[PDB]
């Protein structure tokens, strides 16, 4: 439920996001901050330390595919459920990811954006991204 | 339960907050009211407009309480008993709301102290704020 | 944080469990596997059929751990450190699952010890199991 | 998603539930076990002790209207969202009840049923009521 001004705020800032590094950082921080999420990535190698996770090449590669999907939901912000119907199915029937973890990843992404943008990540900018990440968390919950 | 490294991390990070701590409390309160408007129902008689002086004052008190909890991180239930009396017994604040203010504080620190907000400190700070929240929502008096 | 009355309540209630404790552990494990089938993914090499002897054995060990946590309710992080090593570091059990086994234990006690399962004991037992769950999912070593 | 045998199990047991006492007990126990839920019932008088809550006449009366609604969802188990559309609106726009509290009340009801039925509340009976209470919690979340 974004206003036309919230849609514009969110788009202006996504323009300036490094799409090679932010997804990895977000996924990296999820594995370090909520350590049980690593059980879902046992095929990714060494996740034993924060620096092992943050330098892991498979975490960075996978984080790019996650941020691709957030980018895709920002383009189809009025029809999120559909956009994420195929993906809601992988997380549930094939992977069983409890839906509270989807909200945890959205909140880690909002903090990574705050970390990169500083003063630009104003309270009005954050309030609009909170709407976007809640939308995506709700469309992935099957 | 905080590890010994989690305790070192929290002390060092919050120590870098310093005299900006009330300023960061007020920003976190402003981010929580804008991002999650249902939290305004706990402050019915407050001016909650931008730059409000009652939010600046309340931000300073919340920061001071967190400094005290950092100083007494090994014995937080004793250090925070009056605040647990207010939040859990008098106000009956729902615990969902403590997750929302903790997020807004983490966002405030990430935006102002990036070089300190590493993945390990983020993890330690998230554990510390969850531990403070558990005391404030418990009735153990 | 458990109150002093919460601690009296837990000791008295669990003391009434007595020698039925392994039997109640196994029922709680059986209720959790049937009601919430996703929990079976943590036990891939277990026979999880009704009356299975591996579930009876595991039910007895979970009950024994809870008796030990009741005896050391004031110092649970020290008492439960080996089990926190297994659940949080080795198994990486998601915390949502600790809410599901706590519910199945409460249902097991309500069904077998009704006269003890008063509203005050229910409240104290719910607080104790949430506190045990927090230690088991924390890495504080 | 109840099997024909789960539908029958659940109906057999609801038949034998006291509809004057179980709702009150469930609502009573919610206010005692999750003490912040009392902020929503400040107009109900004395809630200061467990026994004050459990004897409060307004808690018992209100608990009857809650159990009425569970009874109504058991009759329309295939169309829960609709059954609870008007009620999802009171809890959200007029009352703002965070949806985690809906799941907490369903789990307290399952424990009150266990307390009254003992051995009859078998693991197969509980597994079917867990489905029913999850359904009702999901149709009240707006
Ligand atoms: C909340 C937003 C999230 C989005 C947008 C997202 C998106 C994606 C995408 C695009 C893929 C790849 C799908 C494919 O390759 O076909 C994927 C796979 C996966 N996701 Fe997520 N995801 C999210 C949250 C989570 C969470 C919370 C977990 C676990 C805690 C998780 C665990 C996985 C796993 C295990 C895979 C399979 C990856 C592999 O096989 O290597 N995801 N997700
Ligand atoms: C990190 C967590 C929190 C800390 C450390 C904290 C700290 C404080 C402190 C220090 C006070 C004032 C004490 C006094 O003047 O006597 C206070 C009051 C208050 N807090 Fe919190 N708080 C936290 C979370 C919350 C949350 C989540 C809410 C609700 C959404 C909330 C609502 C209130 C209210 C309504 C008051 C009373 C305000 C008044 O009328 O003066 N607090 N808190
Ligand atoms: C009240 C909470 C819990 C207690 C007290 C508890 C206690 C125990 C104990 C005593 C053991 C065995 C220790 C040993 O033999 O060395 C154990 C092992 C285990 N627990 Fe838990 N547990 C709890 C919750 C859970 C939950 C929620 C899950 C997952 C859904 C789980 C999964 C396991 C698994 C997979 C093992 C290892 C089994 C094996 O392969 O032998 N536990 N737990
Ligand atoms: C989960 C299942 C629940 C059901 C089926 C349920 C059902 C109902 C019903 C039938 C009413 C009366 C509506 C009317 O009178 O027109 C009602 C009112 C209400 N419910 Fe619930 N409810 C549930 C959960 C909750 C929860 C979790 C809370 C708060 C923690 C809550 C707080 C209220 C309040 C405040 C009212 C207004 C009562 C009054 O004004 O005195 N309910 N609910």
Structure tokens at C97: 């699952």
Q: Give B81-88's long-range contacts (Cβ < 8 A, gap of 24+).
A: B81/B141, B83/B135, B83/B136, B84/B135, B84/B136, B84/B137, B84/B138, B84/B139, B84/B140, B84/B141, B84/C1, B85/B141, B87/B136, B87/B137, B88/B136, B88/B137, B88/B138, B88/B139, B88/D35, B88/D36
Counting every residue written for chain B, the total comes to: 141
What is the total residue count of chain C?
Answer: 141
Q: Is B40 on the interface with D (CB under 8 A)?
A: no
With contact defined as beta carbons under 8 Å apart, do C8 and C51 qualify? no
Q: Are D118 and C114 in contact (CB under 8 A)?
A: yes
Using CA positions, which residue lies closest to atom 19 of ligand 4?
A: D91
User: Pick from D138, D142, D5: which is nearest to D73 by CA?
Assistant: D138
Nearest residue (by CA) to ligand 4, atom 25, is D102
| Cα gap B104→B112, rounded to integer Å | 12
Angle of the C119-137 helix axis to the C4-17 helix axis, nearest 10: 90
Element (H, E) at D10: helix D4-15
CA D17 to chain centre: 13
Give contacts of C27 with chain D, Cβ < 8 Å: 123
Q: CA A141 to CA A35: how far, in whole Å?
A: 21
Residue C86 is part of a domain; what is its CATH number?
1.10.490.10
CA of A70 to the centre of ligand 1 (A): 11
**Domain A1-142 sits in CATH 1.10.490.10:** yes
- Chains in touch with C (3+ beta-carbon pairs under 8 Å) read A, B, D
D142 is in an annotated binding site: yes
Q: Give the count of alpha carbons within 13 A of B39, CB side only.
A: 19
Q: Is C113 in the pocket of ligand 3 (CB under 6 A)?
A: no
Could you tell me the end-to-end alpha-carbon distance of chain C, in angstroms, rounded to an integer?
Answer: 21
Minimal CA separation from C116 to chain B, in Å = 22
* Ligand 3 pocket check for C137: Cβ under 6 Å: no
What whole-number distance in Å separates Cα of residue B136 and Cα of residue C1?
9
Q: Is C48 in the pocket of ligand 3 (CB under 6 A)?
A: no
Task: Specify binding-site residues of C for O2.
Answer: 58
With 0-12 / 13-18 / 19 or more C-beta atoms within 10 angstroms meaning exposed / middle / buried, residue D109 is buried
Residue of C55, C122, C127, C130 to mutate when probing chain D, most D C-beta within 10 A = C122
For A104, residues 6+ apart whose C-beta sits below 8 A from its C-beta are: A30, A33, A34, A37
Residue A5 has which token pair?
A: 């001004």
Q: Which of A84, B90, B127 is nearest to C138 (CA)?
A: B127
Tokens of C52: 């299975």
Residues 6+ apart with CB under 8 A from B26: B55, B56, B58, B59, B60
Q: Are the beta carbons of A123 and B34 closer than 8 angstroms?
A: yes
Contact C1 B84 (CB under 8 A): yes
* D35 contacts B94? CB cut-off 8 A: no
Give the number of domains in chain C. 1
Angle separating helix axes B119-137 and B96-112, nearest 10 degrees? 150
What is the number of other CB atoms lying within 10 angstroms of the CB of residue A14?
A: 18
- Exposed e or buried b per residue across B45-56, where buried means at least 16 C-beta atoms within 10 angstroms of its C-beta: eeebeeebeebb
Q: What DSSP letter does each residue of A4-43 carry, written as one string?
A: HHHHHHHHHHHHTS-TTTHHHHHHHHHHHHSGGGGGGGGG
| Binding residue ranges of C for heme b | 87
Half-sphere exposure of A127 (CA within 13 A, CB side): 19
Distances (CA, A) of D129 to C36, D20, D44: 12, 20, 29
Residue bearing tokens 């199991």: C129
Label residue C60 exposed, middle or buried (CB < 10 Å: 0-12, 13-18, 19+): middle
Q: Determine the Cα–Cα distance for residues C38 and A141; give it in Å rounded to an integer.
A: 15
Residue C114 CB neighbour total at 10 angstroms: 14
Phi, psi of C52 (to 5 degrees): -50, 145
- Cβ atoms C62, C27 nearer than 8 A: no
Distance of CA D16 to the CA centre of its chain: 16
Question: Between C and D, how many CB-CB pairs are < 8 A?
Answer: 57
Question: Side-chain half-sphere of B126: how many Cα atoms within 13 Å?
Answer: 21
Yes or no: say if A112 and A22 are a contact pair by the CB < 8 Å rule.
Answer: yes
The answer, for C116 touching chain D at a CB cutoff of 8 Å, is no
| A40 neighbors A104 (Cβ within 8 angstroms) | no
Q: Which two tokens stand for residue C21?
A: 């404790």
The C-alpha atoms of residue A53 and residue A104 are separated, in whole angstroms, by 17
For residue D38, give the nearest of B41, B92, B137 by CB distance.
Answer: B92
CA of B137 relative to ligand 4 center, distance in Å = 23
Angle at A89 between CA D77 and CA A7, to 5 degrees: 100
What sections of D16-122 are H helices per DSSP?
22-33, 50-55, 57-75, 80-83, 85-89, 100-117
Q: How many alpha carbons lie under 13 Å from residue A133 in its C-beta half-sphere?
A: 24
Q: Structure tokens of C61?
A: 């060990």
Block residue for tokens 């594995």: A31
Q: CB neighbours of A22 closer than 8 A, spacing ≥ 6?
A: A63, A67, A109, A112, A113, A116
Q: Residues with beta carbon inside 6 Å of ligand 1?
A: A 37, 40, 62, 65-66, 69-70, 87, 90-91, 95, 97, 101-102, 105-106, 136-137, 140
The residue among D132, D116, D25, D9 whose CA lies nearest residue D69 is D132
User: How does B99-133 read in b/e, with b if 16+ C-beta sit within 10 Å?
Assistant: bbbbbbbbbbbbbbbeebbbbbbbbbbbbbbebbb
Distance (Å, whole) CA C81 – CA D17? 44
Partner D contacted by B38 (CB < 8 A):
yes
B113 shares contact with chain A (CB less than 8 Å): no
Query: Could you give the CA distance from residue D5 to residue D11 in angstroms, rounded to a whole number?
Result: 10
DSSP state letters, C45-99: TS--STT-HHHHHHHHHHHHHHHHHHHTGGGHHHHTHHHHIIIIIII---THHHH
Cβ atoms of C73 and C10 closer than 8 Å: yes
- B68 conformational bin, left if phi > 0, alpha if psi -120 to 50, beta if neither: alpha
- Coil/strand/helix, residue D122: coil
**Residue B90 to residue B139: CA distance in whole angstroms:** 11
Task: Confirm if B141 and C3 have CB atoms less than 8 A apart.
Answer: yes
3-state secondary structure of B114: coil
In terms of Cβ atoms closer than 10 Å to its own Cβ (0-12, 13-18, 19+), residue A3 is: exposed
Known binder of ligand: residue D116? no
Residue B7: partners with Cβ closer than 8 Å, 6 or more residues away: B73, B74, B124
Query: How many Å apart are CA B58 and CA D69, to the nearest integer?
Result: 42
A-C CB pairs within 8 A amount to 20
- Provide the H-helix boundaries in chain A: 4-15, 22-33, 50-55, 57-75, 80-83, 85-89, 100-117, 123-140
Q: How is residue A9 written in tokens? A: 């705020």
**Residue D32 near residue D50 (C-beta atoms within 8 A):** yes
Secondary structure (DSSP) of B5-26:
HHHHHHHHHHHHHGGGHHHHHH
* C7 CA to centre of ligand 1 in angstroms: 42
CB neighbourhood size of C135 (10 A): 20
- List the single residue in C91, C94, C137 with the smallest CB-CB distance to A98: C94
* Spatial distance between the Cα atoms of B14 and B30, rounded to a whole number of angstroms: 20
| Cα dihedral sign, C16-C19-C22-C23 | negative
Q: Which chains touch B (3 or more CB pairs under 8 A)?
A: A, C, D
DSSP symbols for B44-94: TTS--STT-HHHHHHHHHHHHHHHHHHHTGGGHHHHTHHHHIIIIIII---
| Closest by CA position to B116, among listed B127, B129, B104, B125 | B125
User: Residue D137 belongs to what H/E stretch?
Assistant: helix D123-140
- Dihedral of CA atoms D34, A102, B110, B6 in degrees, nearest 10, equals 60
For residues A46 and A116, what is the distance between their CA atoms, to the nearest angstrom? 26
Q: Which two tokens mark B82?
A: 């009056």
Cβ <8 Å between B94 and D96: no
Q: Domain locations in chain D?
A: 1-142
Asked if the Cβ–Cβ distance from C1 to B127 is below 8 Å, we say no
Q: How many angstroms separate the CA atoms of C139 and A48, rounded?
A: 13
Whether B30 has its CB under 8 Å from any CB of chain C: the answer is: no
The closest alpha carbon to C140, from C97, C80, C98, belongs to: C80
Resolution in A: 2.3
CA R_g for chain C: 14
DSSP letter for C18, please: G
d(CA A80, CA A96): 21
Q: What is the CA radius of gyration of chain A?
A: 15
Size of chain D, expressed as the number of residues it contains: 142
CA distances, C52 to each of B84, C36, D50 (Å): 46, 18, 40
C30 and D123 within 8 Å at the Cβ level: the answer is yes
Q: Is C113 on the interface with D (CB under 8 A)?
A: no
| Gap between the Cα atoms of A141 and A122, Å rounded | 29
Task: Supply angle C-alpha A107, A112, A113, rounded to 5.
Answer: 95
C35: tokens are 């009601």
Distance, in Å, from the CA atom of A99 to the CA atom of A92, rounded to the nearest integer, reads: 9
**Whether residue C97 has its Cβ less than 6 Å from ligand 3:** yes
Nearest partner of C105 among C35, C6, C7, C8, judged by Cα? C35
Which single residue is written with the structure tokens 């009601």? C35
* Domain carrying residue B40: 2-139
User: Tokens for B26?
Assistant: 């007020």
Query: Among C38, C85, C94, C134, which would you mutate to test the A interface (most chain A Cβ atoms within 10 Å of its Cβ)?
Result: C94
Contacts of B107 in chain A (CB under 8 A): 110-111, 114, 121, 126
Q: Do A131 and A2 meet the contact criterion of CB atoms below 8 Å apart? A: yes
Q: Quick one: which of B4, B3, B48 has its CA closest to B30?
A: B48
Number of residues that make up chain A: 142
The Cα–Cα gap between D6 and D73 comes to 15
Q: By CA distance, what is C77's nearest residue in B?
A: B1
Residue nearest to atom 16 of ligand 4 (CA): D87
Q: Pick the residue of D30, D31, D33, D39 with the most B CBs within 10 A to test the interface with B by mutation.
A: D39
How is residue D57 written in tokens? 């006449």
């Amino acid at each position: 439920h974004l206003t036309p001004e919230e849609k514009s705020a969110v788009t202006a800032l996504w323009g300036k996001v490094n799409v090679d590094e932010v997804g990895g950082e977000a996924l990296g921080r999820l594995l370090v901050v909520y350590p049980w999420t690593q059980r879902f990535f046992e095929s990714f190698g060494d996740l034993s330390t924060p620096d092992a996770v943050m330098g892991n090449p498979k975490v960075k590669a996978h984080g790019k595919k996650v941020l691709g999907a957030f980018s895709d939901g920002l383009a189809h912000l009025d029809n999120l459920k559909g956009t994420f119907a195929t993906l809601s199915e992988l997380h549930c029937d094939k992977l069983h990811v409890d839906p509270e973890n989807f909200r945890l990843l959205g909140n880690v992404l909002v903090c990574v954006l705050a970390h990169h943008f500083g003063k630009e990540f104003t309270p009005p900018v954050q309030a609009a991204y909170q709407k976007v990440v809640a939308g995506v968390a709700n469309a992935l919950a099957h | 339960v905080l590890s010994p490294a989690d305790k070192t991390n929290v002390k060092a990070a919050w120590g870098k907050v310093g005299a900006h701590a009330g300023e960061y409390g007020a920003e976190a309160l402003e981010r929580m009211f804008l991002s999650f408007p249902t939290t305004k129902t706990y402050f019915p008689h407050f001016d909650l407009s931008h730059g409000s002086a009652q939010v600046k004052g309340h931000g300073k008190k919340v920061a001071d309480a967190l400094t005290n909890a950092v100083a007494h991180v090994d014995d937080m239930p004793n250090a925070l008993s009056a605040l647990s009396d207010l939040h859990a017994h008098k106000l009956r604040v729902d615990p969902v709301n403590f997750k929302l203010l903790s997020h807004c504080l983490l966002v405030t620190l990430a935006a102002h102290l990036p070089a300190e907000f590493t993945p390990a400190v983020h993890a330690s700070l998230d554990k510390f704020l969850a531990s403070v929240s558990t005391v404030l929502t418990s009735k153990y008096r």
